[model samples]
Target: GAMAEEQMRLPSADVYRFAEPDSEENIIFEEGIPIIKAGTVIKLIERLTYHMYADPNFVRTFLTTYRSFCKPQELLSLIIERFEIPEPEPTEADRIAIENGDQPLSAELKRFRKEYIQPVQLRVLNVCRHWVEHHFYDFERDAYLLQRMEEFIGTVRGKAMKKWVESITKIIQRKKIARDFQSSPPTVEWHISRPGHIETFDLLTLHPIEIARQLTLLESDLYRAVQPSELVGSVWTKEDKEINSPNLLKMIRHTTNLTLWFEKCIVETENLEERVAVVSRIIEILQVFQELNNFNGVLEVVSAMNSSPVYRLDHTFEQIPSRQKKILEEAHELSEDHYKKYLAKLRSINPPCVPFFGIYLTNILKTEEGNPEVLKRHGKELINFSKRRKVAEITGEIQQYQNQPYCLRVESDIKRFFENLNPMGNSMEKEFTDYLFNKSLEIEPRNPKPLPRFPKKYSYPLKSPGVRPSNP
Candidate 1:
């Protein structure tokens, strides 16, 4: 009964015969020579079709020989009948737009159909014809199909994005603050219970738990700005450019704000010890971020420390204790040239990691710029497998991290504190430089210590009287 049901489920004669590989019923004897039956021929054709699509020469030879077979018309009809084209289905959003009298939404739907849907359908049709004619098969069908799906989904997402942009624009237009007032310097209010006090707290006393919360919040913001799909391809289309550019800019602005805060902490301090202490605190904060596996925060802190205004201060660095200096070195090592250490660490660690996305972006850009967009192997212009694999690997890592639950809890005040921090502009550079210059002059320079020299040789006498003196 089970065998009968399976046979009914797969009604293909080729499948049934192929399943009984050792059965004598599948073979025929004519003039004492073994011959494959009609079912076997059908099975071979089915297997050959998949191969023909993969290789042009194979298909060319196959079609030429296929025509010579007895009753070729019937066989050709069978092959043609097997080809199936999937129909495009309307999404829920499409139904809603159609039902409602939204002229703009209707127009957008029409444009998407013309721009994406129709072209893809035509291309699929052309591909089938092209493959049949000259055995010239393009392997980009799957990529195009994936792209069509993404774009269809993107059209829905685009509507939401458009509404968001328009809402922001409306808010900006409604609140017409004077140009002079907008340009005015931000007021620095002092609060006794402010989270900024954490900056001044001693590095040795600070714990990772509170700092982990802050890093988690920053990571959430960074992750939100980056879309994993956008990381796949190097080139951006018009729609992708519109959707992704603003998010990228937002991430840059956030990192810039962090650097500015680091600069402000250094320049605002009157005491040399206090300035060095602030640097120590920053390094400790970076350590905390690292412990929490937050590479994004680690990168931001390292970049701020390595920025010209902070790094160029020779005298200020001279005050940093050996322990703090070592900590800074180790933290900097994680983000140093090309982020080799960080990448190695990233691979070694499990999920729930916040990767420094800048490195991944750099890698993608490099691969795209250096290698051909399409690959040719064995005389076929195949899709770029290398690029796709690279994208998949990076995307897999991102998805894994994104899937993990964020356990760290951040308070509202701390979130607001980070959000309100101002980015440093051109106006701030002069003050920072002037402060560094004056501090350099104010502090006495330390004399350089000479490199320690080792003794040429130390002679040690052997225990036995006859033994020669040995060099120690």
Candidate 2:
């Protein structure tokens, strides 16, 4: 309302100027146009004059002349004529003194170097360290820049300066080592070689327990690989936290591959029996994951079965034996229900437990965002003790898992099989759906009996009005 009223009363710039012609605001008139003077320019020059050994009269003359010019460009040409500053002409002795790492200049030059040059060099070094640590520099392209930096630092004489340069060099060396190590491929010996015709085999032959064990090993490897440095203070806002962490990225990729591999298994096999068998194996794997206290693996296996390509085979799923079907239902129930069952189990469990990391991360995100990272305590700002305590509580649980050694020893071939299974792309979805539809049509006619009626799927456990013998 105040803004609207101001706009109404002072409608035009010209009208406001005419109404307040004698106003003491920094307004300068040039050919009927009013230009406001930048108060910063006057303050800056005044500050500069205070630090310099300049004539008071010259400083006054310069400031007066500088204020008259409405444009910044107009004042630049007049600065040399208005200000009287003597330029230093270094003698032979001065050059020799500077070369010998001694200060050899006028008081003005010495002060200028101390007040400006040193601060700027410190800032540049800080930037260089940041760039090096964050991998912002191209090694080949910026090679000359690093050399020039060393040369520049050579002229500066101090223990602190030498230490800073040495620290940077050490970081650069470590970065090179890390880069080389990452580029090299790992060597692993396999007791049993992978099958060439793996696609043709029955999916159930893979052994669900073995698959679960391998998955656990993979997760354990990721957990061990994670560095405390990868955990950022601003975890919620920093989206690139996952990208910076190799272990976190691998965990996500492995989980995604699990889902994609399941879909691929369903589509690649034309036999309905084999497809049903794949689902059965996945359900069994989920049970094994549960037994291992690996909720992350359990969640991924459940998700793979519930994926679109696998879930669409309703007729095939219905044909599963009642016992196996009940197992599937129980697995789904544990995963669903807002994961209340999983959370309760998680709380009841001891150390060496692998939590469903997604849930943990979500809870951390909620806690961090819901409360401020800093809090006012006793008239002083302090780190949010409550927030850190909450985070530490969860991280403490994770640390317990990390401390335990991976007990399962997987064969290298089995490890290679899961690692090398390429995820299916979106292009295969149409082909997969078409094949599933065709297969469903053929099966529906043969099994003419109507499917058995069951209670609502994913319902809360044991809290319904009536409990049935068949209810999961």
Candidate 3:
């Protein structure tokens, strides 16, 4: 009987609610019904703003300055500056119009460009460039530090000290203010409470120190809100605006959620054991965001969530638990595959060819030699070679890595390894390969000779311990 009743349940909530609002009169459902009220929309937007924005002051400041640059012309200039694209030389007509200070053409350009460029193109890219260049590192570092601070603040000793200071300051200030105000009576008082005016004033007069202290604490919390992005300094600067904005928003949203989860865990979980369990879960979520926090993955998650039946303004975050496994699996697969391909491409080349810092050499060394001294020596040589090539003379023969020639001769072979991977990895591989090839050719020519090989058996001498053999 229960099974039969359960089977009668409507598949869709919309369908279930379509049954007329409990009334005698028959009614037909209207197409395109306004299910959510305007007030609900406002509330959801406010909630998002509260969670996402660093501070309430940010909106006020933004609004105050928004009009000057919010216009299409100003926004266009901002976009141009962000991309660092050279301003196109104005045509003869444009130059003539500018010389004459033609109001109509200038206004037209501002309107046309703002409408065409700013909304669909410029604003999004600017946001992305801002994220990549500046915000990512601050976000990551602050978040790490904030998590540590929260842990400290949760301790009994720390909390007790904070409570004592807060309470003492509040009590001392109230007595002082009451005494000061009584000595100098106000000129005006309400008819209902001329006598009680002192009482009201006493209640309302908050301590400047307390107010300042609370403001400082809020500011500290705001500073901790940023999270680092793996996409920092990436080549995605050249990507389309449509591709970038959604990607960036996803990274921001995930970090914001993780921060909230961490804060909640610290505050709500009572025992150290429970806190540890909650923190472990939060960290796992953070790793997922760190991996998929790129543009494509972000767009997919956001788009799917927005479209899903379970999506609700009041409970979007709760839905993440259900989606976590699949999203993380996809992100892990994408990030791991990218990393592996990066390693493979990095292995085939001599990084010194690009005249970069010797750090590229560390990218090689696929098989770890048993001796740490050998590995360390080779690593140091690679570094020296790279730094020298970057700023010193590259005449004669370039240095070798583990007795192998410093530069790899085959270019196409190295490129093919990168070409088989995902889009993200392919770009990185091409960049490193191109740098090596160019740097190799950048050096002055040397007489060709057979490359050296690693010694079949090598041993570190006790006298100068940790030095590799000069020759194989």
Candidate 4:
């Protein structure tokens, strides 16, 4: 190893006190501790036990987010290479000393194991357990990797190693059993609404509270499944979103579906009066969303309401009750100031709420682009780990929220309705928007007079309570 020719510097006590933790970092920190960033695959692997023992946070971080730079097949293969370490043997001088009994061969071997082998091997095992436990999806996707792991574990030599093997064994069974239960897409198809592919108990019939609950259930699943790797490097904005950001893509798709569904329900209705009713009903659902702190839901319904086609229906909104419009007005306030209000709300609210991910996604993109991944400081090139950890900080917020589960009961009927509303599948976004706008014009016909003949229609019930939810 080349020495850092530049002497490392210690800061003044005052400077240290003011610097935030994980900030003021460089590639080689105080102990020549090289942060992981752009490095060879070998450097990355060797750093797994860069010290005598593994850092659990480091191992988990690598396991969860390494997909940006490495593939699972390549990772497991590299890891196995690292684990197949050579046994340290006594040198010729050491052999002579052992023969004199001052240091026996067993003692030499023991010394070697303690100083070298155990540190390297134990952490490899730790890394493997995390790989299987936290990243079982990688194995589920590729049988060869799982087989490689099982084979690798089978040849292990001691009780110390066996504990890890037992854990790997247990979780594999647990995950496999869970997978079998969840693999039934057929049953999911049977129960959930299949728009993109629900007639009985469709979107119109469900109560707003019920609508909010089911949307929360579906959104939480999508939001929770999003891996750190998915949001890293602004991968969701890439063309390979389906491959790299599968959970994110689906979450975005569902958001689009929910938005599109609202517009579809509004425009597809022929009666001018029924259209306003749909808007109010959708707004009420938006209220339920805000009431429950489903900000992802808030983003979608707000998007639906503001969608050019729906927003263009001036007369339809005219019929919309005054109290109903204030909720929409309140929503607009959260989105202004560049989503600062949403972030404040996200911070202040309790857990079990789906914090809006789009805002987070955009913030991540800016953070990634705005900051350099590598920086120069103290005349040494640093990994700019502060930048990386900031991204993690934003992402870690959602991880915290996802940890707390909502208490709401799952209704599979409405669940199916949301689950199946995969509208993003066939949506030609522009063409559909134009078609809906055309539909809006035909129904209300721009600056049109109120319908006088249909007094019976206006006499019907109003869904809008014309009141906003007190607290989200």
Candidate 5:
């Protein structure tokens, strides 16, 4: 009874390590820090901004990729839940202790409030503030999210962020007014390259520079959509098996389809001089990509030229003009030294450009494998925050440039033509590969194995995904 009079203590600790065994089921001590890998959506959000520590990387990752599984409203509400601090009246005994000035108990409670409770709430507040600023479009379109955010901003931390947010929202409205009234650029026209006999994408109708610009913007758009979640677990080998990596998979496929389109377009022109002209046009497009600082597009044309089918075109390569030959030689540097030259160019390039995405993906995944998620120090396991921070830094570069969209207006007709490339299937398919190989052989037969005899049926009934303007 006398010992009981001394006091009872709270079960919780000021920090995660204060407790003996971690029952943080939602978290795993993978590398050096605790990783929030819970199964439930509720726990996922809760674990994201854990007590006592604020992970800046998680804040960015969650803000960037939450659209895959969470709604703006739901996230806003969840953030509100995390932001609200506990009221003194919530616990009756605590109130009595505080009122009585129970020195030991009150001191501990206040210390925990300062160390654990307040930090978690502030982290949520700051994260919400970032989302409000960086992704204002989310709020502009959705009234409830903005309202919920406004209410959030009005709460306990009003003085620190509200004025800035108000100015931000105000500026967004003014910007939108100007944006809505602006006129669009003139639409570029394309001529059909093939008559009705076989399906043709009819790409030759547009100038080389115009085609290059379209490819850059389209590929740039796809690249911009990728998020850190896809690269985090390094599970892309299975074709981005989870929905988290959707945009990444889409971008990779774009490269293959673009390459296939090149092989098809170049080989279809069976005449030697005609093939040389197509090759020259393709090089010019690649040259424009280099000029425009779109390494992603640069890789596309170069890779297509170097594909087994296209590279084997001995006759066309022979007739390729001297100036165009120099372009191909320079473009080859993009793929050399494990793409050192490509990265060198990327580092020096300005914004409103696209990058070689594979370089980053490779570096990010390798970072994950080499660095354990948690590190064992003495007897305790801690989250390897360094690994996550590095990954975020890489993905952060992607997030950085994606916001700087090109000034070029999209031509929906050409966009449609690009999206449905090959129309049959992915270029990796055996059928597509063999067909291109056969075409390559027909155009320039090999010394050892001459062109295969007999012709397979030509691809027929191919419709241009775009409609030509008839009235004008």
Candidate 6:
């Protein structure tokens, strides 16, 4: 509204540039034909005097004088002058610099290296000597220029990071002595000489793209670990919590574009199985990251599984439609029955056997399908199974599956009966047994409560060992 009133009051035509004697333009110019008075003309002549005297020998003096009055053209010329820098002519000295492995890093080069080059060398490389030569350019407003500069920087950074990662990996490989020490021709040997976990974690310090590649390699190694009995025990279990572990924070801290990389690896993948596989890897790594802060009781149970003899399958059966639908429910029932039956047998066993029985259950969990539900169920059982044993008469249930043909030539071990599986048979089983031993020592009560008629004296044994003889 204010602009509208101002527009109505102001004259539509400007009369400062020209004059007509009786025209509308002339009304703003009360004087006859000349809007530029004598004083204005003198001011203009005074400004042009310096330019006229400075270039006495020049034939373009008249044109220069005319440009002095042209304000818009003067501004345009100044802008053109700012951008117009001649390309450097390489003389013998400049050629020598090039031969000596010096790069062209000029302040006015408009190239990417100029950003990284030192100021003194930049001045010598280019004819222009302005300290901040790039400041005059409005690069942010120019999308094309901004994009080109970003690409140049990104390329340089990417190449530098790639070389760095490669060098480090080579160095670490050089330090490994595991393969060189195979002297004893024993049938089976445990490998205790893989690269330390920190070595893997340290490698993530490089660029984001390189870190992603490293994690992918880790996933591949873990997947390959699933096959052939000989190498299966060598693979690091997902439950093994170490001080330094490859994790989500490690991935993000190394990569500036983590979300983009994750989406590229996971959501945009064409192969459905590979996509799911990568998702599982991410989940495992993330879980390890979280466990680093608080060592949860549940994770301890998973660690027990990791230490057990049986090779747990990490495979997902959901891809198979028929097995997918009721698989979860069936597993739930199996676990329920196992807990109920184990509780009954545990009551009759000696108190010392309770810890061993817990270890046995931990051994069984190693054979469990590596699904979230199964992991949770096993974890809960490990924590509570020994407690349940302290209070029934059922044998521990063991299931056996077999097929019989009518015309068998001989009876064999194949026509089997269900038998008690050993709780400690190998290294993994021993590890599980050891873990349960440690856990029971930490949490199990030191002594049992005395029976009601047996005596209150035995209940407080340290104070009244002498009085305990009468009550029993």
TM-scores, all models, native as reference: 0.47, 0.47, 0.15, 0.76, 0.65, 0.13
Model 1: lDDT to the true structure: 0.49
| Model 1 C-alpha RMSD to native | 21.6
Distance from true location, Cα of 143 in model 2, Å: 14
How many residue pairs clash per model?
Answer: 0, 0, 6, 4, 16, 0
Runs of candidate 1 with Cα error greater than 4 angstroms are: 1-212, 235-242, 268-270, 336-338, 374-386, 425-472
Worst 10 residues of 3 by lDDT: 460-469
Best by lDDT: 4
Off by over 4 Å in 5: 1-58, 61-116, 125-201, 235-242, 373-383, 423-428, 448-472
- Compose the digit string of candidate 6's lDDT tens values, residues 239-316: 531211223223222221222223233332233354344434333333332222111111222332232211122222
- Report the candidate with higher TM-score, 5 versus 6: 5
TM-score of 3: 0.15
The candidate with the higher lDDT, 2 or 3, is 2
Q: Write the per-residue lDDT of candidate 5 for residues 1-472, one digit (tens) a residue.
A: 7544322231322322122223443234333555543223454466565665667657776676565456778887776766554432225666777678773355555765666566666667667667765666566567777777666665554444555556555655664585481445435534444323224445555556667777888998898877665666564665535444677888988887887788888887776666676777778778878777788888888888988889978778887778778888888887788887877877777876888787888888788778775555445454545566677678787777777577666766667778777623644567887888787878788797664433433233222222222336
- lDDT tens per residue, model 1, 73-160: 3443444333222223345677676668643335544654555434433333333333333321111223453334234323433332
The per-model lDDT (C-alpha) reads 0.49, 0.52, 0.28, 0.69, 0.65, 0.26
**Could you tell me how far off, in angstroms, the CA of residue 141 lies in candidate 4 after the best superposition?**
0.8
Q: Where is the poorest 10-residue window by lDDT in model 2?
A: 460-469
Tens digit of per-residue lDDT, candidate 4, span 1-472: 2323211121223322111123333223323334455333444566664435557656766665666556888887777766665554566877788788786456555765666556666778878888888878788778998898888887878757778778878888899999982232111111132333345454445455667767887898888898776787677888877777799888887887778888888877767777777788888778878877899998898898888778877768898778879889888788999987887888898766888888888888899899886666555555444456567777776678776567676766678767787543565977777787887766666554554222223333444433342244
Writing each residue's lDDT as its tens digit, candidate 2 over 338-401 gives 7888778888987555667766566666765787754443444433334444554564455566
Rank candidates, lDDT, best first: 4, 5, 2, 1, 3, 6
* RMSD for each of the candidates: 21.6, 17.7, 34.0, 8.8, 8.7, 32.4
Evaluated at residue 200, the lDDT of candidate 3 is: 26
Could you tell me the TM-score of candidate 5?
A: 0.65
Candidate 4 to truth, TM? 0.76
Q: What is the lDDT of residue 191 in candidate 1?
A: 20
lDDT for each residue of candidate 3 in 38-64, tens digit (9 for 90 to 100): 111122122212221233332222222
